[PDB]
Amino acid sequence: SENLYFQGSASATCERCKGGFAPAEKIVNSNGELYHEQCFVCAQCFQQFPEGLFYEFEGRKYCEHDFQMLFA
Amino acid sequence: DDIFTQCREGNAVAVRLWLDNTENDLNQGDDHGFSPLHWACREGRSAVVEMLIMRGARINVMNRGDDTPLHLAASHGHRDIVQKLLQYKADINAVNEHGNVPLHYACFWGQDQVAEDLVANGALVSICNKYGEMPVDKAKAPLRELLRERAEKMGQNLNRIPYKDTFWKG
Ligand SMILES: [Zn+2]
Ligand SMILES: [Zn+2]
Q1: Pairing assessment for the beta strands A60-62 and A2-5 based on DSSP bridges
Q2: Integer angstrom CA distances of residue A68 from A47, A55, A64, B5, B131
């Protein structure tokens, strides 16, 4: 994933929370999906993914620790 | 086709037949500690949740991440199940491995009606998780502000409570 500074469409929304962005807001692009910084985080612990690595379970994204604890 | 799958899917007749054999342990968790009740709550299977509870399932069971059934019902927005669990004495401020309570998840996922119901039933808004984040601060602003207002008018103190448990300071 990459950090960007938003200057996009008025219609643009965060893939996780569906809220919009502010001009110049620091956001994250993961595989073409845009996120607030506080939204590109693990669904279980709410923290940033170490080294950007996440694991999906039913459309939610988890860090290695929480994926291994709950779903692996 | 085990009991855990039947609970996830809401296969009521199969769950009922399985429970009829009293040699089966209705509290036993799967490979990651999810009980029948955890799965039925997580997936919104109201009739199966009720059947489990009324046949004696323990309400405060914990999976490998120390989530309770109420964490899962709240996280996945199943409003009626939240209410049923609270009626049967679920701990509204139960704490998982990260120090998160059910309200953290209702807030994070914008389950506004669940979050409001939790505060109306006394769920504390000011209790930090292990990383210093209070549950209401996982919400988007309109909900975040509303829950603090509702909590104040229900007689909560808004002072931030840093995380503590018996093992926190050795
Ligand atoms: Zn967002
Ligand atoms: Zn995590």
Answers
A1: unpaired
A2: 16, 9, 6, 20, 20
User: What kind of fold does domain A1-72 have according to CATH?
Assistant: Cysteine Rich Protein (2.10.110)
| Domain annotation for chain B: domains and CATH numbers | 1-170 (1.25.40.20)
Which of B65, B108, B140 has its CB closest to that of A70?
B65
Residues A21/A27, Cβ–Cβ less than 8 Å: yes
Q: What is the chain B residue with the closest CA to A20?
A: B140
Task: Indicate yes or no: CB of A46 within 8 angstroms of CB of B131.
Answer: yes
Do you know the residue count of chain A?
A: 72
Give how far the C-alpha of residue A68 lies from the chain's centroid of Cα atoms, to the nearest Å. Answer: 19
- Sorted by sequence, the CB contacts under 8 Å of residue B52 that are 6+ apart come out as B7, B15, B19, B26, B36, B37, B40
Domain layout of chain A by residue ranges: 1-72
Q: How far apart are CA B137 and CA B141, in angstroms?
A: 8
